[PDB]
Write a protein that binds this DNA or RNA. Structure first.
Ligand SMILES: Nc1ccn([C@@H]2O[C@H](COP(=O)(O)OP(=O)(O)OP(=O)(O)O)[C@@H](O)[C@H]2O)c(=O)n1
Ligand SMILES: [Ca+2]
Ligand SMILES: [Ca+2]
Ligand SMILES: [Ca+2]
Ligand SMILES: [Ca+2]
Length: 903
DNA sequence: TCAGGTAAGCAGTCCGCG
DNA sequence: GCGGACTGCTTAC
């Protein structure tokens, strides 16, 4: 089989590589790699190396990597560009693996782990590491085994051996409910003493050294704790055994106030699952506890225990150990669903980077382009210093706040990447500039045609049409991968709606799930078989359909993020190909495209209605338009439609057969106008929105830019079994909005769009009646807390102190001596509650770490001094007043005199 | 901690305002 | 009270 690398590090003049050989085996080698960099040479030296601009360069092959980095510095102080790959381990992989890598994940050791530490004096600080490590669970992907290291004897308590039998039992039964399917995969190892546990945990680590190391907060807690504790007990060097090359780099001290620790282990790729999740999941969560993410992702219950975690081992050692095991498995379960490890490996190997570099699209693109250019004997330019400068982005139309009954939206496929490819935007394809007319003049096709020769953007930039730039070329490859994955994702989505529909009339039989591939649209045969299936079978098929969609999503949305990040990276000063003339060439072209097509759609729809100057496009943002379909419905009748699906069908047919071809001609003309390389402005119908036929629903509403709600029946060709609310930007969508209030507001909106005003009014009264009885957490606001030290003058609130930062300082002055109180962590999220004046906390709000209950000692005083009135007004009533007034509806009646009375 | 991006809404602070 | 200048935060794209 084909060779592939696992990890690569540069340690002095040595490249340290772990890899898989042609026989499927893991090996390791130290290489004194001889790197090459480049200088511009006179037009006399018959060389085969040229820069991207086509200017000759002489190759300089250094004896070692120290001399190369030295040469770079000497070139700088001489004022001359030193061209080539300055990150030598990237050059090394390029040379060593000069082909498209075909990797085998089965041969990659993926390890998932976590530890436990009992601490009777606050959060067991990883930097200090003064409390014994009393549990470690380590899952090895290759063995498929959960290795459990359990400490029986400690200064903080002598405990009994963990029991797999009790662990397997359900919590209803007094067990711990360790999932049944991993019980036979647990290798349990107990210990008389902390030293012999750590030594054995070092041995096995050498025997089964992780390539990919992950888990939950492993970079921030587990890795620095295991390192530092072995450092405090055995010393250094023995601690360095965690590295296959026995080289670590402690950073780290990030104060104030303060004061944490981060460890780099050379030869291991640390992909903290929390960081994978933040980057690739496309969520923004109110909490990042494993308990909260697991519930969200997997619908599993929280890991409940009695009393503080500082006394859990002592009071229930059994549960302590089970919960440590379960924590490790939850990350595996989250990953089986989300498949971020798979995604990290796909990308890392495609770019030929260290896998942990997939967090950086600048690194990723730098290596993709480097490899692309090297393969053509081209030489990459030196990275340069640039000042951070603002630059313009997208156009967003100002909507008239109103209700909008029937709406069809249209949106461009992969806009910024498509623009890159259409205009041929690249560092080396810059041809020149032209005199820029105001944007409005290009939008209205009245300005002089910019060029008859080059491919233009309305920001004044001209590009060669003839040759293909490296940026278009490489963005195209990844776009085509995204297209394929998105194709699978939408098929699984359509298939999911087929099953949901069938679930309306499930059959009374038994009966097995059909053995189908959910990535492909169901055939008629399969759809007929589906209509005959039981609920049980249908439900299992739905789960599989949704799992397939989710995998499809991860694959597609993160390739979209990658190619979009190339557009953004042209505007980041740390990118080798940073160029604001290219970054704005995209954004400005996008502004023109949107407004150009708004004009063409209005003109077409006016033409077909035989009118003039009516505005049909009601809104647009970046690359999308929203078109009022009222007249289209009202012209044919409304009573002529047998059902909702009949008019959805009608609008679908209209957009496809009438509007899309008009849109197609419009954009083709724009391409000619800008004399672009390739027409790639492909705008397809996205949403079809409206109220249920015969209802009093308002269908949709806008309050302002980036703030609207729509009742959608079809999204990009997915005909839903039940209408879906597409709500953008409103409080329902915000992670700062209380949990209960998100749901309440969504139901307010549902009733507005589907059922109408009386229905809303009925619901409002119900929620206002129940509010005070809801759980304090579910009704608490959420906020990230940055720069706490900046507004800490007391610790009392300083000048212009943010409301939530005030809450945090009010918190800190209540849990002063409390050793068992959780500390707010700079950058993390907090719940925030208003307090009634006169309260004992001495301020108008209290904030505390999100995802946790507030401490026992102060909990009851928060509850008694909570200001429900101010809370209900802030989080529920005020936003709702925004929605309803834009929609021209009331959530409440009158006031006003009577009353009437009954007696 | 160390390197995609901009546009833009709302919560809240502070203060001007006869 | 409301509004404008401003910071902070979180969203749409
Ligand atoms: N995180 C994001 C999302 C959007 N945009 C930009 O806004 C454009 C439109 O965004 P959107 O329609 O959400 O994505 P598209 O890239 O056009 O992809 P799709 O085909 O899914 O619509 C993108 O091309 C780009 C961006 O820079 N970064
Ligand atoms: Ca789009
Ligand atoms: Ca099968
Ligand atoms: Ca049926
Ligand atoms: Ca869009």
């Amino acid at each position: 089989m084909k060779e592939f690398y696992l990890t690569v590090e540069q340690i002095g003049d040595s490249i340290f590589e772990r890899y898989i050989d042609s026989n499927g085996r893991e090996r390791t080698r130290e290489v004194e790699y001889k790197p090459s960099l480049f200088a511009h040479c006179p037009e006399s030296q018959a060389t085969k190396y040229f820069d991207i601009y086509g200017k000759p360069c002489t190759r300089k092959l250094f004896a070692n990597m120290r001399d190369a980095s030295q040469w770079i510095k000497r070139m700088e102080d001489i004022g001359l560009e030193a061209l080539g790959m300055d990150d030598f381990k990237l050059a090394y992989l390029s040379d060593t693996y000069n082909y498209e890598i075909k990797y085998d994940h089965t041969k990659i050791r993926v390890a998932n782990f976590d530890i436990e530490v009992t601490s009777p004096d606050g959060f067991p600080e990883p930097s200090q590491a003064k409390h014994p490590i009393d549990a470690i669970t380590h899952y090895d992907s290759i063995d498929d085994r959960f290795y459990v290291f359990d400490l029986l004897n400690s200064p903080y308590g002598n405990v009994e051996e963990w029991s797999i039998e009790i662990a397997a039992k359900l919590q209803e039964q007094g067990g711990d409910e360790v999932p049944s399917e991993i019980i036979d995969k647990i290798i349990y190892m107990p210990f008389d003493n902390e030293k012999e546990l750590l030594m054995e945990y070092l041995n096995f680590w050498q025997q089964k050294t992780p390539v990919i190391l992950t888990g939950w907060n492993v970079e921030s807690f587990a890795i620095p704790y295991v390192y530092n504790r072995i450092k405090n007990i055995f010393g250094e060097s023995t601690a360095k055994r965690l590295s296959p090359h026995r080289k670590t780099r402690v950073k780290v001290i990030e104060n104030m106030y303060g004061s944490r620790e981060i460890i780099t282990l050379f030869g291991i790729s640390v992909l903290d699952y929390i960081d994978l999740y933040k980057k690739f999941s496309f969520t923004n969560q109110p909490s990042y506890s494993l308990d909260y993410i697991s519930e969200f992702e997997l619908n599993v219950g929280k890991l409940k225990y009695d009393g503080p975690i500082s006394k859990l081992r002592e009071s229930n050692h059994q549960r302590y150990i089970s919960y440590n095991i379960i924590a490790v498995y939850r990350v595996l379960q989250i990953d089986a669903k989300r498949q971020f490890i798979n995604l990290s490996l796909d990308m890392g190997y495609y770019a030929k980077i260290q896998i942990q570099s997939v967090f950086s699209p600048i690194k990723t693109w730098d290596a993709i382009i480097f490899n692309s250019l090297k393969e053509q004997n081209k030489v990459i330019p030196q990275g340069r210093s640039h000042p951070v400068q603002p630059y313009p982005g997208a156009f967003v139309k100002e909507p008239i706040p109103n209700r909008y009954k029937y709406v069809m939206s249209f949106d461009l496929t992969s806009l910024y990447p498509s623009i890159i490819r259409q205009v041929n935007i690249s560092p080396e394809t810059i041809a020149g500039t032209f005199k820029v007319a105001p944007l409005h003049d290009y939008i209205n096709a009245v300005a002089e045609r910019p060029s008859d020769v080059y491919s233009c953007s309305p920001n004044g930039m001209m590009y060669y049409k003839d040759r293909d730039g490296v940026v278009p070329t490489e963005i195209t490859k990844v776009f085509n991968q995204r297209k394929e994955h998105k194709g699978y994702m939408l098929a699984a989505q359509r298939n999911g709606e087929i099953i949901k529909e069938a679930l309306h009339n499930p059959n009374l039989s038994v009966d097995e799930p059909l053995d189908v591939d959910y990535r492909f649209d169901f055939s008629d045969e399969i759809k007929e078989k589906i209509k005959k299936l039981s609920a049980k079978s249908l439900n299992e098929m739905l789960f599989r359909a949704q799992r397939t969609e989710v995998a499809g999503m991860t694959a597609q949305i993160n390739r979209k993020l990658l190619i979009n990040s190339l557009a953004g990276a042209l505007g980041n000063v740390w990118f080798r190909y940073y160029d604001l003339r290219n970054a704005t060439a995209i954004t400005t072209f996008g502004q023109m495209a949107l407004q150009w097509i708004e004009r063409k759609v209005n003109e077409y729809l006016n033409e077909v209605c035989g009118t003039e100057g009516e505005a049909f496009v009601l809104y647009g943002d970046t690359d999308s338009i929203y078109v009022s379909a009222d007249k289209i419905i009202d012209k044919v009748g409304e009573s002529k439609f047998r059902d909702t699906n009949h008019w959805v069908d009608f609008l679908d047919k209209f957009a496809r057969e009438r509007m899309e071809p008009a849109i197609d001609r419009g954009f083709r003309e724009m391409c000619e106008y800008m004399n672009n390389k390739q027409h790639l402005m492909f705008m397809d119908r996205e949403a079809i929105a409206g109220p249920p036929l015969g209802s009093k629903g308002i269908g949709g509403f806008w309050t302002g830019k980036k703030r609207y709600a729509l009742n959608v029946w079809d999204m990009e060709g997915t005909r839903y079994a039940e209408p879906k609310l597409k709500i953008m930007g409103l409080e329902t969508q915000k992670s700062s909005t209380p949990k209960a209030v998100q749901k309440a507001l969504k139901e307010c909106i549902r009733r507005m769009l589907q059922e109408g005003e009386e229905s809303l009014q009925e619901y409002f009264k119900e929620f206002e009646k129940e509010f005070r009885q809801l759980n304090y957490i579910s009704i608490a606001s959420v906020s990230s807390a940055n720069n706490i030290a900046k507004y800490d003058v007391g610790g009392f609130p300083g000048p212009k102190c943010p409301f939530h930062i005030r809450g945090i300082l009010t918190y800190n002055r209540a849990i002063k001596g409390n050793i068992d109180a959780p500390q707010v962590v700079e950058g993390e999220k907090v719940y925030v509650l208003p307090l009634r004046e006169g309260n004992p906390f001495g301020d108008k709000c209290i904030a505390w770490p999100s995802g946790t209950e507030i401490t026992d000692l102060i909990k009851d005083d928060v509850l008694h001094w909570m200001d429900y009135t101010v809370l209900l007004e802030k989080t529920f009533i005020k936003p709702l007043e925004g929605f309803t007034s834009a929609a021209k509806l009331d959530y409440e009646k009158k006031a006003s005199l009577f009353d009437m009375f009954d007696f």
